[PDB]
Each structure stands twice: as structure tokens, then as C-alpha cells.
């Protein structure tokens, strides 16, 4: 007698992890970037760059 085409069934689980990294920024160089008070020359200074 013949044979039948067998097959199997597999169930797998998703194992969860997570990575993280961080940096900072100095309070002295905070307002130097976003601060829109600098009118005419500090907007193209060297320390801003």
C-alpha cells in the first residue's frame, strides 16, 4: 500500500529584550543652540558651530 504525504506543525514563541543608550548636554551650551535671542553676529560665531 502507498504512503501519504505527511507534514508537521511547529509553534514558536517571541522572546522580548530591549537595548538602551544615553548621552547628555551641558547647561552652558543649551541656550547657545535654540536660543533665538542672539540677533546679528553670534548666530554665525565660532563657538556656536
Amino acid at each position: 500500500p502507498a504512503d501519504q504525504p505527511v507534514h508537521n506543525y511547529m509553534i514558536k514563541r517571541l522572546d522580548r529584550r530591549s537595548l538602551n543608550a544615553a548621552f547628555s548636554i551641558a547647561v552652558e551650551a543649551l541656550g547657545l543652540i535654540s536660543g533665538e535671542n542672539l540677533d546679528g553676529t553670534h548666530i554665525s560665531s565660532a563657538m556656536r558651530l
Binding site: 553676529t41 553670534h42 560665531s45 565660532a46
Partner: peptide, 17 residues
């Protein structure tokens, strides 16, 4: 004023005096 290395070569207040 903050310049790079580029180079060239009133009111009436109350007071005592």
C-alpha cells in the same frame, strides 16, 4: 561683538551732584 580672526591692516534722571 564677536569677530573671527579676520583683520584690517540719553535721558533726564533725578540725581544730586
Amino acid at each position: 561683538v564677536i569677530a573671527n580672526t579676520n583683520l584690517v591692516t540719553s535721558a533726564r534722571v533725578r540725581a544730586d551732584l
